[PDB]
Amino acid sequence: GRRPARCYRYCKNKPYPKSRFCRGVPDAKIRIFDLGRKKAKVDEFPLGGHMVSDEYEQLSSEALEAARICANKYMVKSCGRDGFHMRVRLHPFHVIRINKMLRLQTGMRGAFGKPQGTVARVHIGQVIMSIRTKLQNEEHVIEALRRAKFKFPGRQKIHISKKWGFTKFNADEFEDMVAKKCLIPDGCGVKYVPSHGPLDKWRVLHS
């Protein structure tokens, strides 16, 4: 079994990712990071609610997919099977280690341990999880992110963004920029079309 999670809570070591050097890590528990109808466009699924860490700590990969699951089946149950898109925005890149003991060399002789799991190092203000829905589901994204808090160790705050969706443009100005072709909806996100470049891209934009 894995150690209790207060053993690996604070960011004490320097980042130790899997590479040519740290070989043979076990695979992370969380493998799926986006969820809901992923193919939903940007045009009318506008609300974006975040989950922001209040502490500088490191979260296990077991706990990232425990809050992936418990926020999914609340959003499924109350906003439908496809009325949402959630996105986990932490990848478990740091590798934690274990010094297994008890015919080896006893004690702290040779104490550099073996890789044991993966965590995600997280900062103050860093977004943990995002959900985008219809605008009339603000009551439910606040509840699903509140119920994902109980899976994580430290302190988190729930926050409703000012941006449109998962984009980086403010929702106050989003429709005006789509109207005047400063933005172009491609898929989940949006392309910014600047006022420089060759002029044939201006011509095909104003065909």
């Binding site: 002029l199 201006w202 011509r203 104003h206």
Partner: protein, 290 residues
């Protein structure tokens, strides 16, 4: 598309250009590094090099020493100024290479005033000669050869301009292995085969050859010799008259010209204001066309 573009934006963010005069393909910075650079304990002493460059219609010969600002040319002698001395044509063959190197030397030695001190080899043998310095006089002007990017094989014309400059009196360290009269399978130098390349006898034979077999390709290969009436049997003396005319008067005097206006023959850069309304009336005339 299907293939990955190699010249993408990240290709140009990491591209280092070569030097300005490398990517024109004019300078070998490997060779120049060993050629223009003085030993640091011969401190501000110049290090002169003879620069022989052969274009398609001219032979440039010039002595330079290097400075941080750029190379400083001390004396330069061209081959298109040889018709002043009496060689109207064949101004890039081996014979005019000798005449240009001889002109470059004699123009330099009276520039310094050493011209009667170091006379050089007046009668052209074609054999190995070296100017040695005389005690009590100024030393001989010591110089080195910058052939450039030329393939320096035996008979190359840059060694003809060297041979003219040694006979003119300069001190250039050389060997006779790349003069035309050298025989590679014998490692033997003739100095009579080489003498005839100075006098233009390789050309004189081929003129007599095209006279007696083709006579219509003769007017094709030597169309300008016929116009200036340069017979094959008057040519060896035509350079002997030329070399003495060099040694008579090597000084380059030049004519100024003043009566020119400020006529733009090219086109200036468009201002910022002209550039951004040009797009503004392209965007206008695009929407006006629909």
């Amino acid at each position: 598309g299907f293939v990955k573009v190699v010249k993408n934006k990240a290709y140009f963010k990491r591209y280092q250009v070569k030097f300005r005069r490398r990517r024109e393909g004019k300078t070998d910075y490997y060779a120049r590094k060993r050629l223009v650079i003085q030993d640091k304990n011969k401190y501000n002493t110049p290090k002169y090099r003879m620069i022989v460059r052969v274009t398609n219609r001219d032979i440039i010969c010039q002595i330079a020493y290097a400075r941080i600002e750029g190379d400083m040319i001390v004396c330069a002698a061209y081959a298109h100024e040889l018709p002043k001395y009496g060689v109207k044509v064949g101004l890039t063959n081996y014979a005019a290479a000798y005449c240009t190197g001889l002109l470059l030397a004699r123009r330099l030695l009276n520039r310094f005033g050493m011209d009667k001190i170091y006379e050089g080899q007046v009668e052209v043998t074609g054999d190995e000669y070296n100017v040695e310095s005389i005690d009590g006089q100024p030393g001989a002007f010591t110089c080195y050869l910058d052939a450039g990017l030329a393939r320096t094989t035996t008979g190359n014309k840059v060694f003809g301009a060297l041979k003219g400059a040694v006979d003119g009196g300069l001190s250039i360290p050389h060997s006779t292995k790349r003069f035309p009269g050298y025989d590679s399978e014998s490692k033997e130098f003739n100095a009579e085969v080489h003498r005839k390349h100075i006098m233009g006898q390789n050309v004189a034979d081929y003129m007599r050859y095209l006279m007696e077999e083709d006579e219509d390709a003769y007017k094709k290969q030597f169309s300008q010799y016929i116009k200036n009436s340069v017979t094959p049997d008057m040519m060896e003396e035509m350079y002997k008259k030329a070399h003495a005319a060099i040694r008579e008067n090597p000084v380059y005097e030049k004519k100024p010209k003043k009566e020119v206006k400020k006529k733009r023959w090219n086109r200036p850069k468009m201002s910022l204001a002209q550039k951004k309304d040009r797009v503004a009336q392209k965007k206008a005339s695009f929407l006006r066309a629909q």
